[PDB]
Each structure stands twice: as C-alpha cells, then as structure tokens.
Symmetry: C3
Subunit: 267 residues, 3 copies
C-alpha cells in the first residue's frame, strides 16, 4: 500500500503544480483543528490553504496521505475486517485524483453561485457546503466498496460540524454547491446530476409513515433522482423515489411528491 | 452516594449481561471524544461500543458512573447548592436502570423506522437522534427534581453536537426516534407518547408574537401534547398548547395550529 | 495598541461595576472551552459567568482583551496585511463599549421573549442565539472596516457551534433575539431594526436560480430590510431585496417574496 500511496501522492502533487492560480496561495493561513478526515483531506487536496508554504513538497502530501490511509484503514477494519479494509482504502486511493478534479469543479460552482464569495480561497478555508462535499466524495468511495458502517460515521462527523446530512450512498456529480447548508438532507439512494445548487433546509429524501406493523424494508431506491442544472430553494422538501428533470427551478418551502419534468419553475 | 452508585452499577451490569445479542459486540470500535455527559453515558449504557472489551467488568461501569456522578453533582452545585445537587443526582442514579430499558426501545424504534440502518451497532455509535435522546433522558430527571439551569446547559451541548433542540422539561415516552434531526425543536412543556417518529426541521413548540408590552409570562403549558404512534414529517411546525391524537400522520412542511384528532393523515 | 487596550479595558471594567445585579453573579460556573473568539469575548463582556470571582480585576479583563486582540490581529494579517489588521482591530477596540451596551439589550430581549428563561445568567451561559450575537457584533466591525475573509471565518465558527448562519455584513440593531436558532440564515446585505425576534429555520436572505450563463454578480443589496418590533415565525423564508415594515408578525413556514407593510400579521 505504501508504494501505491507514493504514486497517488506524486499524481496529486503534479496536479497541484498545474492548478490555476485561483487554487493557489502564498499566504500562511491561521491553523485550524477539525475532525480527522476533514483535517487530512484539506491538506491533501488544498495544501496552500492548510499548510505553511515552507512545507509543501510531495513528500509532505505523501506523509498526510499515509496518516489518512492508516486512520481510515483502522476504522474500516474495526467495523469490518482487515482484508475488506485494504481493498476499500486501495479504492479510495485509486479515486483521489478524480475526486480532486471534481472538487475543483465544486469550487467553481460555489463561487459562480454565491455573490458573497470574494475568491476560492475563502470557500476552501471555511465554506461548510464545501467541507461537507470534500468528506462526502471520499465516504462515497467506501460506500461503493460495499462498506456500510464507517462511511456513515464519517458523514456523521460532517453532520455535527456543518449540520449538512448527506448519506454516503448518495451519488452526486460535479459542479455541486450547497449554500448555507444547515438542514440539508440527502438520502442513501439520492442521485444528483451536474450543476446542482442547494440551499438551507432542503431535503432530497424520504418519509416513512408508521405501518404498525413494525420493521420497514431495508434499502431499495426510495430517494429522488435529480438531473442537471437544478436549483432547489430554501426549505424545499423533495420526497420519494421520484424524478426531477434537468434545468428545474424549485421555489422556497415547496413540498414535492411527484415527478417534475425538465425545463420548469415550480412554486 | 458511593454505595448507591455501586448498587446501581451492579444492576446496570446485570442488565448488560442479559441484553439480547443485538445490544452486544466483540468489536473494538474507534475511540471518540465527545462532550462529557454523552461520553460517560455512552460507556455506561453501551460499554461494548465505547470501551475495549478487555475492560468491561462492573467495576469499570461503576468507575465511569462515578466520574459522571461527580461531574453532574459539581455542575448542579455551581448553579444551585450542595444539598439540592445531592438529591438530584440520587434521583438520576435511581432512574438509570429504567432509562436503560427505555433507551433499548428507542433503538428498536430507530432500526424499525430507518431503511438505512444496517444494525443497532451503527445507531448506538453515531445516530444523532439517539445521542440526543441518551442525554435528554438524563437531563429530564434533573428537570423533574426542579433543576432549571444545568439541565438546560447539558441539552445545549446536545444542541451544538446534533442541532437537535430538546428542552429538558419535555416529557417523552419510549420507542422514540428522531431521524436526521437537524432543526428539531421540542419545547419545555411538550408531551410525547410512545412510538413517535420525528424528522428533520420539526417543531413541537410555540411562537410568541411581540406584545410590546415587553416581558412574556414565565412557563405554563404552551407546547403540543402528542399521542402514540405519531409520525411528524419533514418541516412540520406544530405550535401551541394543542393536542395531537394517536395514530396521526403529519405531512411535510405542515403548519399545525389546532387540535388534530386520532387516526388521521394531514397534508 | 496596548495603551488603547488598557483604556478600553478600563471603560469596560467600570461598566461592569455599574451593571445592574442581573448582569452579575457570585457563583463560580463550570469551566467550558469553546472556539477562541467566543471564549475570549464571553470573559471580556460577562466575566462573572466565565471567570472565577477571585480573578476579576480590570487587569484580568485587559489580559483577556490582549489575548483576543493578538489573535484577531494575527488572523486578519494572514488574510490581508499588517497595516490593515492594525486599523481593523483598533476599530473593534473602539466599538467594544457600545457593543457591550447593545449586548445587554439583546439579553433583555431574550429574557422578555422566552417563557423558558429563568434569568439572564442562563442566557449568558448557554443560549445559542446569544453566543452567536456576541461574535456577530464583533465580526460586523471587521466587515465595516472593509475586511471580507476572516470576519466570515469567525462567523463560520458560530455557524458550526449553533447552526445559526449570520453573514458578518448583516446590520442588526439592539434588543435582538434568536430563539432556538438552528437553520437561521441572515445574509450579507440584510438590515434588521430594533426588537427583532427570530425563530428556528428563518431565512432573511436570497436565492439564486441558475442563469447558465455561469457567474453571478458580486454583492449589491439583495437581502431583506426589516423594521422594528418584527417577529419572524418558525420556517419563514423572507427572500430578496424587499422591505418588511415595523410591527410586523410573520407566521410559520411563510414564503415572503415582496414588501410587507408596517403593522400587519401575515399567514
């Protein structure tokens, strides 16, 4: 695994070197301490914003990547087993370059969708929707390996830190932006296309009225599918195994229970 | 107090030994550090999930229970007095076995109400509705002793950690489940029956439009009473000294201002 | 700067001495550790509640004020420059007495608007709306100096701790109260008068439906202006560059898109 880490850290470092200036800084930002997965991934993906400049080298990216790998491996092993952990973490490592590319697009979307943002640096440093998506994109790779415990725990850390509630099972394309974010809920089987803009208190999920009865069916597709270029306004509750088309605008406090066709505004 | 602690820890230990296998694990889970009351109560009620297996003995349950008792006593004394603190903490100790039984039913309700849950172990480890209810059930015993300060502070820790806002005065029966949970508000005089299922952004509370005037009447019954087998959908705002009957289903974003009779679906 | 700190700490100390008894306590409260800006400002503005009584002297207020000044200066410098930082922190220091006076009125409003509050001491110690406003009032002085980065980071700390989302650019008058608070969003160009009472899940903000296109106009007045004696009920979404008059009552889950005239109740 250490040799694969070296190769992945090398690729991520070369990407860092080739990133546009907006993804770089010569500033030494105030040191913060957040939960482990975010702390580590912040340094790995955007070292200029979370490390002293005198320290960014490839070797240091590799060093942080190793600390992260060892931590996730340990946690996956606790809930599962040693072999399953190795395979899942190799899968995360495999996807880190593509995630890095996607996270860049999420930043572009954040700046493009928010008149309050002065530059990418502030989004990177402290935008809660962005902190959540960083961790989500890794948690999802775990889910894709069949893991069902630690990937949820990781997202519950995100949940506590940002009040954004994204199940690791959700599938989310790039140029993704959650603004403000408190009360956002995105379910296990939610599917979200490119250029989705989501506001505070938005649910892309499900409700289960008590059938007593007692014990609800496990899993199955039961959360919305959302197309490209969708904007979901504050307080909107989109519920059930329903399809929202592309280029859809959803108004504030809307209660959506059925399919919504492409190229529409709902209020 | 130490002799009463020993007796209570003995009872809790015997209950632990007699718990069904779903409430047990041989796994050594990743060590977490959360606010004191939750950290301690997690170990006391579900040691398999928060202690190394080589350490669970009765003596260790007693040890953790002592640390918790000393901490709560100290905090209650700060806001009140030494004698009042002793009585309140003796009352908590008294209720710990019954709370343990109730918390088991809350877990059953959580698993039964959530298709995303793979087993009780994940709910125990990281479900925010469950973390909140653990602390709430103890905070409520303080409120029942007449304490009005520290029990609120304790629940504000829960508030920061999970964004679930349950006043220690609320009365809540068993098989209780808050799914997702961000934005849940449950007021001081709210009464909730058995098998209540509550989603994100649900208020069981009150609003006070300014009478200027100036200073609103203190206390009194002013929050909803809810029966058994009630499901309250995402964003529902249930306000005032009103009665919701049993077997009631409440739809998303609903604004409920008046009594709702038993065996009904509202949207 | 140290001589100006001494003078400001002297004034704040004299104000402390002249505060009514409700703003004082002989109790030694349980020690808490929260994010730096709140930790420091809590001690500076309300030392009786966050320091051991044997330690409150003027010299100790000055000591804490220095620690805060050094921290904010360091963070402002990181995002901007040394000279800009000095000017901004001198501006904060300048405003601290007036902020102290305003924070007293916010407490009065909190107690007056909440039947659950037993005394100012509990609001001071743990009410999340109040913790947020303490930090907001300082963050706003930074914004007023033209700072756009660290003042946002500071409020994102508030955001994580309380789930209350107040842009440092918002202008808010005194006797301000957010009850419960989770999901409150108050935008960069929001203007709020005296005696505003706000509940959980209230947005005073804006939504931006995707014009693709791509990159939205930066800034400009785009969030609501709210008059005096306004109460905004749970879940209300007040959006756009609109004017809400004085003595307005807004009902639960309301979706407000246009001007609302003075002396009105909306549902």
């Amino acid at each position: 695994m250490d040799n694969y880490i070296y190769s992945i850290a090398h690729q991520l470092y070369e990407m860092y070197l080739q990133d546009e200036d907006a993804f770089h800084s010569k500033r030494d930002y105030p040191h913060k301490k957040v939960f482990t997965e975010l702390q580590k991934l912040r340094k790995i993906f955007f070292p200029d914003f979370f490390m002293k400049h005198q320290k960014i080298t490839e070797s240091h990216i590799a060093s942080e990547l190793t600390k992260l790998v060892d931590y996730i491996k340990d946690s996956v092993t606790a809930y599962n087993d040693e072999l399953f952990a190795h395979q899942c973490v190799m899968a995360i490592l495999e996807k880190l370059p593509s995630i890095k590319r996607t996270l860049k697009t999420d930043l572009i979307a954040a700046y493009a969708g928010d008149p309050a943002a002065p530059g990418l640096s502030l989004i990177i440093r402290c935008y809660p929707g962005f902190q959540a998506v960083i961790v989500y994109r890794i948690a999802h790779v775990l889910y894709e390996c069949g893991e069902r415990y630690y990937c949820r725990e990781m997202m519950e850390s995100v949940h506590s830190y940002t009040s954004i509630d994204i199940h690791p099972g959700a599938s989310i394309k790039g140029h993704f932006f959650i603004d403000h974010g408190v009360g956002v809920v995105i379910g296990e089987t939610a599917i979200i296309g490119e250029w989705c803009r989501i506001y505070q208190s938005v649910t892309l999920g499900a409700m289960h009225f008590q059938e007593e009865g007692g014990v609800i069916k496990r899993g199955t597709k039961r959360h919305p599918t959302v197309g490209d270029y969708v904007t979901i306004g504050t307080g909107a509750k989109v519920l059930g195994n329903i399809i929202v088309g592309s280029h859809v605008r959803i108004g504030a406090n809307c209660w959506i229970d059925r399919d919504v066709d492409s190229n529409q505004t709902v209020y």
